[PDB]
Ligand SMILES: Nc1nc2ncn(CCNC(CO)CO)c2c(=O)[nH]1
Ligand SMILES: [Mg+2]
């Protein structure tokens with residue numbers, strides 16, 4: 349797909365169009381775009397004006413790259429992301445992650461809306477991603493497939509420690525300072541292709557494999573991020589309890605859930621920003 353140079357050119361283009369030099373990158377999922385307000389000294393670029401960038405076609409994804417200061421911390425946010433079901437191969441879905449590494453970003457925060465498989469989860473819950481299950485990877489659909497680019501990372505990167513332990517600990521401390529009634533959930537995220545929603549037999553199956561939440565994104569990004577050395581932290585906004593007995597999922601409802609949790613996710617991410625090291 350892309351050559352090392354391609355990533356370089358896009359990085360140089362961003363560096364020369366804004367004075368902002370982000371240390372952290374945040375990828376906002378479906379209905380999580382609101383995080384971009386409260387960003388101060390913001391600078392926005394539409395994905396379409398940035399050389400080599402893909403386009404967001406899904407409802408709820410603005411398709412804008414936003415630079416700014418969040419809580420005394422310089423960062424860059426993807427208001428909208430890319431999904432495999434849209435038609436993009438993983439090397440396109442993850443293009444932004446390598447660009448961020450080339451800008452000097454050290455930490456990546458991934459976020460998404462997902463279905464809750466763990467029966468103890470409630471709509472509106474926030475689940476820290478402690479680990480993931482990459483179903484597409486089982487069959488070979490992987491962003492690292494093909495010749496390896498030594499300049500980014502190694503041929504066989506390990507994924508067992510993908511989700512930084514210290515940041516997860518910090519997220520737990522930050523949450524207690526918020527005095528929330530609900531406790532911070534934590535679990536395994538499983539990714540499948542989409543775009544259709546799962547059947548009851550599929551959900552039972554996912555749950556029995558040890559999954560706590562299901563979605564159609566994020567995993568490709570974490571993989572590429574770990575491959576090029578970025579520290580990674582992530583969470584799912586539980587948008588609905590999945591049906592396990594023989595209603596029905598719809599995107600509008602997931603977006604609605606995102607609006608309702610806006611105040612909560614915004615303060616949570618703001619506070620969290622003051623806890624990133626380096
Ligand atoms: N039952 C269920 N609830 C969900 N909430 C979000 N997603 C992730 C899929 N996200 C799509 C449509 O919301 C847009 O990226 C899901 C899902 O796959 N299943
Ligand atoms: Mg400015």
Ligand SMILES: [Zn+2]
Pocket residue numbers: 365
């Ligand atoms: Zn210009």
